[PDB]
Every structure is written in structure tokens, then in C-alpha cells.
Symmetry: C5
Subunit: 183 residues, 5 copies
Amino acid sequence: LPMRYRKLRVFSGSAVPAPEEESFEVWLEQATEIVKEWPVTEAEKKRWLAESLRGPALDLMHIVQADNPSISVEECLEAFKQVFGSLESRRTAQVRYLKTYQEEGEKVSAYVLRLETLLRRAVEKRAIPRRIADQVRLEQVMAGATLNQMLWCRLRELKDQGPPPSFLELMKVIREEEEEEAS
Amino acid sequence: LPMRYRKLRVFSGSAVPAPEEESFEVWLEQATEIVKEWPVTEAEKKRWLAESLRGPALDLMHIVQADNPSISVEECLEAFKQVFGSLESRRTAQVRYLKTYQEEGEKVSAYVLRLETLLRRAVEKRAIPRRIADQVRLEQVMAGATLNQMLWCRLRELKDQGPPPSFLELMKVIREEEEEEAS
Amino acid sequence: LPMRYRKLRVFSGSAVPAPEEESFEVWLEQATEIVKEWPVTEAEKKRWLAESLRGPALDLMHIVQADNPSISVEECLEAFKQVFGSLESRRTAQVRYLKTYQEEGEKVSAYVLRLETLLRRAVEKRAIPRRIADQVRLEQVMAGATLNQMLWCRLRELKDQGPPPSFLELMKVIREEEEEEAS
Amino acid sequence: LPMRYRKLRVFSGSAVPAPEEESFEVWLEQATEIVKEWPVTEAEKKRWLAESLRGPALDLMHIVQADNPSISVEECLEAFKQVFGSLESRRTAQVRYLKTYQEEGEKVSAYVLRLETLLRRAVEKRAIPRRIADQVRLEQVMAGATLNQMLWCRLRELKDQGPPPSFLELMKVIREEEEEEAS
Amino acid sequence: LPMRYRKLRVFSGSAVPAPEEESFEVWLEQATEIVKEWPVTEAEKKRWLAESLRGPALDLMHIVQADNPSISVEECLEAFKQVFGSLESRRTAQVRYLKTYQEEGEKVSAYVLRLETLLRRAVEKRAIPRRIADQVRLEQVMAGATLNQMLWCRLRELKDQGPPPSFLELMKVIREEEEEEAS
């Protein structure tokens, strides 16, 4: 049998959130689900929507409704996106990707996962053409990582051995090299 | 399917509450819902009402009932408002609004949201006429904020370009100016 | 729809309880409800009763049952009252009331609520006649509080203007005087 | 209506448990209930049984099953008792009782409850004959407690006034003497 | 009646997890159950699967789906095993077992349980033949433990008295020797 009901994800909109809160992009997934999918009455949608909000973000929702009583939940979410959503230039998406380097004590397979989230944003905002993202991924790994020289021998084969690797192919080759023998 | 049942909001009435408690004005929303809407028996209403109370506030509820056994939940909430509700002069509503200035490291869009809660109280208590609240909002932002001079050029257009802006219009113009370019 | 099920109130019987526990007089309300009202089987009553106990208090319940297998839940609660309940002389109820004075930084309306719990105990235990409790309340407020002199002018009217005030009447007159004007 | 479902009691088997865990003798009550009483399918019994285990204790359960696939839950609990249960000589039960004295700031009624748990273990393990446990209780209270001399006058009546008192009789006489008068 | 629904086990994939998280080998049991057994719709499986993930591990799941929309839950778990699963040579399994010695203040029955988890891994990965695991267990206990000399007399009988003992037989003989007499 399906286990315990799952708690709502949550969001404050604060300049420094609590470590249990989500990104706006993820709270907006839960909110889009509640709006589009749930078989529920409007005031019960609105009480489930309201129950997820904290911080400053809870405080906007009342102001917007009082000034327009005809507001649907589909319209109220459009006001919520303007105040708490995100604005970022093409140049900022591009510069924020290319500046990313491996940290102290971070593993190479941890770095290559962290770096892949930034490459998707830069391809959405048309900063990088989708035609060349697999070449741009390999060039940035060899630029930013602290590769051991047996790993260096393999990545230099992938650079030359036909087309550039996919994400899961590159991630496999890295994992085979990360393992150490005990003493 | 609708997710986990939602916890009751809570209130102590203490001089310093726990950071999880609500304002009396919000606990009184939950209490007004339980009183007016829920399809429930009186002793079960009263056990749900009681379950939300803590601090000193829990302690009043017994005293009031013993001295009048005929008391309805509609009458018991009227006694609760007298002891824990709020009293504020017209002059205090007006002075408490006009004294409000931007804090250290606070953003201009955070300040303009914080300031809008105070303008609604002052218009309820008839301190500010509802006829002029959109003019009074722009005059207080230019008085209290630490505007950069490219933002200053735009707000001085809004001051002259016909009628004064609404809340969401002003909030849009501010957000377009707050964003910075990376290096 | 009625919201989430409510957690059991709890009791340790310890010399210093955790701050989440209740007075014995309140845990005994929940226990009296479970005994008298719930439509449940005996071993399920006894498992709900048991689930609320902690500290030393949990440890008594087994000893009492082993020595008398015929024990009903109505009889087992009578043993529980003897060991954890309260004993207090008429003279201690009277002296513990009359010694009560306003604390550092406590408000007058907070003091007059705190003092009313003690006057009910002293009238149950026949230390104070129920005929005169409204006179005894006003005499103790003027004895124990740190009244400002505009409040002093009003309470000295109530002392002379016919019969002494009720609890909610006195509490109204105090609240009208507690409010301050901003600068 | 019966209130919220009750959380499982829990057990680690560790040399120092968390303060929320039970004695093995109490986790084994919950486990005996799940085994004998619940109207449930075997793999769902085994998933409820498993869900209560932590620490080292969780880790044994897998090893035992792999080496004998025909194992019933009635047989698997017999292996669990051998590794985490308790072994104690007749002489250790007797010596551990007789050495028990009142602590700093402990009340006499708290001591006489704490001491009664130890007398039951010593009568199970046949160290003390059940024929004489009420005499042995009074002799140990007068040996171990720090009695005031008005309490001393009453316990010396109980020693001589026919048969020795029961547990609840002795506990009543002690409670009547513990109370103090205010000043 | 079966008690409260049980919380999901959880996993971050982080280099240092929170102390409430499981090993990947145990989160993968819960995930294999959800995939194979639960009578549920695909998007509700995927929302239950997703709800258990945190840390870096939550972040992989989106990337994999976007690059192949035809992916089943049976295929998505195969990608999850490659990135977060475990790689270990035959020589590392063997060396990691044989190096294991008793710690400061650890009991002999606690050591012999801790050591048995390592012997199962080394027999899965074909480092130790299953034909001889009961001999290899006794040789490692006499090598690694700090045995008292009355325990030494008994284990030297088991070494010679026909076939080597099973796990529960050896664990019984150790437990009979660990107990001490009070003073």
C-alpha cells in the first residue's frame, strides 16, 4: 500500500531562506500542479495554495486579491511570478557558466554534475546554440577540472575519437577512473 | 490527489510570541472559518477551537464559560477580541506610516512591499482618504527610499506622466532597475 | 473539512516537567473524556490511556493492574489520582492568593488575568465565600498593582459607584487606560 | 472520535540509547502484539516489525533470514531475544535490590515507587519468596529512607499494628506526611 | 488495528550525509518495492520516487528524463545506479575484511556482529569461497578480539570439537561469558 502522505514543498521569498525551502522554480511546479490538475473547489485550491507560502511571499497574496475581486488562480500566479521570479541577461547566463571551476576537495564526478545544471540555463536563454552543447561541455571540463594524468589520457581520446560524448557516457568514463585500491 | 492535511495556525497572546505563531488578525481568520463554515457539532467545534490556543490565551477561555453557561461560540469570540485584540488612534495610524524609512541592505522592491501593509491600515482607520492613496504612496517612496539616479529619472517621469501608478505598475518599474550585470 | 487530527496532551509526573506537558488537572480532562465518552473497546481505551503517559507516571500503571486483575478503567484512575493529584489546606489556598503582587515589566491587564486563576481555587476550597469574591478582587488589585494616577481616578469611581465590577467589566476599564500615543 | 494514530515505540540495542527509546522489555511488548494480534499479511507484519528497529538491532534481522528462508516471525523473535535480551543471576537480583538508598533531594514517595520496580524482578527470579514481599518492603524503606520523626512515629505503628501494609496503603500514609504549610 | 503510516526512507548522495539517511543499498530496496509492487499510476509512482530524493541525488533525475522522453521507471533506476552505486575490487573486499580489529571499550558480542556484515560482502564478490566462511570467521575472531582466558578456553574447544560453529552458535557461547556478578 502507498505510504504516508507527503508534505508540501515551501517558499519564503526572503533574501536568505531557511535550508528546508525550495527554489522558486520548484515551488512553482507544485503550484502549477495544484492549479491545473487537482479535482478541487476554488476556495479549497486557494487554501492549499496559501498554506504553502511563508516569509514575505505570504504577504503579497492578500494585497493582489483586494484590488481585483474577479481574479482567478491562473491570473493570481501571473502577479506572483513578476515579484518573486527571475530576470537574467543573455550575457550573464554565458559569463556565469564559463567562470565555473572545481572546488577544494570536490570530486570530478561531483563537479561534472554541478556544471550540467548551468549548461541547460545557458541553452534555454539562447546564449549557447543547442547544436554545439556536447562540444562546449568537454572543452569546459578540460578547462576547469584538476584531472590526474591517466584520466587525461582517456579524455584526450574522447576529444579525437569521432563525435563528442553525451552526459551519461562522459560520466561513466570519469567514474571508472575515480576508484582507489586499499592498503 | 490532495496532499497531507494542514496543521492549525496558532497563537499565545504573550508579550513575546514564539516565531511560529501568527498575528491575532490571522488566528481570528481560522477561528472565524471554524465558527461559520465547518459542518460540525458544538462540542467538537469547541474542542477544535481550544486545540489552537496556547500561552495566556488558552487560560481566559475557561473563566468566561463558567460565569455564563448559555454562551455560544459566536458570543465567546466577542469576549476573546476585547482582551487580545488591538486599539489604535487615528493619529497613531498616520504617524506610524509617515515615519517609515529604508533599512541597511534592504532592497527597494522589499521596502515598497513592506510599506504597502501600513498604507492599508491607515486607510481603514480613516486617517488617509481612499481618494488619494496612490499619490500618497509615490510621495512616501521618494521620501523614504535610497534611489539610484537612473531609477530617479524614471520615478520623476511617473510623477508627471498623467495619473499616479498602481501598486503592481510601480513594482514592475522598480524591478526592471534592480538587476545587475556580471563580471 | 475538519483539519488534521490533534495530538494527545501529555504528562510525566516528574518534579520538573518538560515545557510541553500539562498540569495534572488538564491531562485528567483528556483521561476523563477517553473513559466516559469514546465509543471504543476496553483494551483499546487502555492502549490510548497508556500512550499519553511518560516519566514516572507511566511506571505506576503496570504495578496497580498486576495486584488486581478485575480493575476497570474507572477504578484505575482513582489510584492514579492518589499518587499524582494535589493536597492543599484551606489556609494555604488563602495565603497563596493574598501574597500575589505585580512583576517587573508585567502589564496591569496581564496581572489581573493571572490573579483570577488563584481566586477560583480559593473559592472552591471554601477559603473565600462566593458571596464576596467581586469585592475581594477589587481590594487585591488596588493592593497589588502599580497603577498610574489616571487609572487610579477610575478604579476609585468603581469602588464607590454602586456594586463592585465583574471580571470582564474591570478588564475593559483597565484596557482603555493601557494604550499609548506615538511620536 | 478516537484521536491521531500513535507512533511506534523504538529500540536501537546500542550501549547508550537515545533518550526517546524504550527498554527491550517494552519494545518486545509491541513486537509480541504485532506478531500475535494484528490481522495482517506476513510481508506487511515483517515491514511493520522492521520499521521499529534502529542502531545495531536493525542489522541482525537480515543475517538471520538469509541463513534460513523457512523462518516464521515467531521463530525470528526467538533469535532476537538471545542477542539483545537480559541475563542476570539470582544473587545479582538480590544484591541489586538491597543496595538501594534515597538520593539527594528525592522525595520519600518518589523513592518508594522507584524501589517497587526492583522488588518485582527479585520475586520473578525466585530470589525473594512471594510469601514475604510485604515485610521485605517495609524493612527496606526504614533502612533506606531519610524519614522525618513524625513520619517515623507512623511507620513504627504499621510495623506493629497487625499485618504489614500493601503498596497503595503505604503510599497513602507517606503522601499525608509529605505536605507543607505556606508562609 | 495497524498503527500510523510509516515515513519514507531517504538519501542525499552527498559526500557526508545527514545521520538520518540510509545507505544507497537500502534506499534502493524502497525504490525497488515502489517500482515492482505498488498498485499505482506512473506519474504517481514518479512523484513518490521523487519525494524520497534529496542532496545532489534529487538533481540528476530531471536531466536524465529531458534527454529521453520514452524512459520507464525501470530504465531511469539503471541510470541512477551508475552515478550513485558502488565499485569495489576483489582485492579491496578481501583486504577490508582481514584488517578489522576490536575497538576501545567495544564488547566482544558487538565486535562479532559488526564483523559479520563484512564477511557477507567478501563472499558475494567471490573473494572468499562460500565452502570455508565458517572456518574464516573463527580464525578472524581469535586474531582480532581481546579475549579473556576463560573465553579463550571455550573457543579453543570449538576449534577442535568437530566442525566449526555457525554464527548464532558462536554468538551464544560468547554471550554466556560476557556477564558479570555484582558487589
